[PDB]
Amino acid sequence: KVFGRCELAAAMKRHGLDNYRGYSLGNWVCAAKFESNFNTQATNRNTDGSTDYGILQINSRWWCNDGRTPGSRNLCNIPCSALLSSDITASVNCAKKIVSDGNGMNAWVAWRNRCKGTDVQAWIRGCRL
Ligand SMILES: [Cl-]
Ligand SMILES: [Cl-]
Ligand SMILES: [Cl-]
Ligand code: NA
């Protein structure tokens, strides 16, 4: 599923991401825009052989099991394919564990390089929430 900007903001708010660990809703929408272009089916392979999955591009090296990343962890206790669903629940629940691990949203390279220090409120402007 390819979400609209306000559609995704509303789904993320309903799932508890507004101000989660201090990160306003616009930070999460900006991250998803630049990680996946709002597409739940996005995948990208990394140089180390791991793969990133879904709307927030969660990495199989640490967070999910895809059967093809030797010696990886599965810290969210899910198959990576669960992160490509049109229902964003699994991706949101896993992102909450990531953002809590000490490094905040710096775990998402595109957030660090394209959202951090910008006016992220613009990503929810006009939306009914
Ligand atoms: Cl915001
Ligand atoms: Cl594996
Ligand atoms: Cl933080
Ligand atoms: Na893994």
From Swiss-Prot:
Substrate binds at D101. GO terms for molecular function: beta-N-acetylglucosaminidase activity; identical protein binding; lysozyme activity. Keywords: Allergen, Antimicrobial, Bacteriolytic enzyme, Disulfide bond, Glycosidase, Hydrolase, Secreted, Signal. GO terms for biological process: cell wall macromolecule catabolic process; defense response to bacterium; defense response to Gram-negative bacterium; defense response to Gram-positive bacterium; killing of cells of another organism. InterPro entries: Glyco_hydro_22, Glyco_hydro_22_CS, Glyco_hydro_22_lys, Lysozyme-like_dom_sf. The active site is at E35, D52. In the egg white and polymorphonuclear leukocytes. Residues 1-129 form the C-type lysozyme domain. SUPFAM superfamilies: Lysozyme-like. The keyword Signal applies. Disulfide bonds join C6-C127, C30-C115, C64-C80, C76-C94. It catalyses: Hydrolysis of (1->4)-beta-linkages between N-acetylmuramic acid and N-acetyl-D-glucosamine residues in a peptidoglycan and between N-acetyl-D-glucosamine residues in chitodextrins. One of its GO terms (cellular component) is cytoplasm. It is found in: Secreted. Monomer. Belongs to the glycosyl hydrolase 22 family. Lysozyme C is capable of both hydrolysis and transglycosylation; it also shows a slight esterase activity. It acts rapidly on both peptide-substituted and unsubstituted peptidoglycan, and slowly on chitin oligosaccharides. This is Lysozyme C.
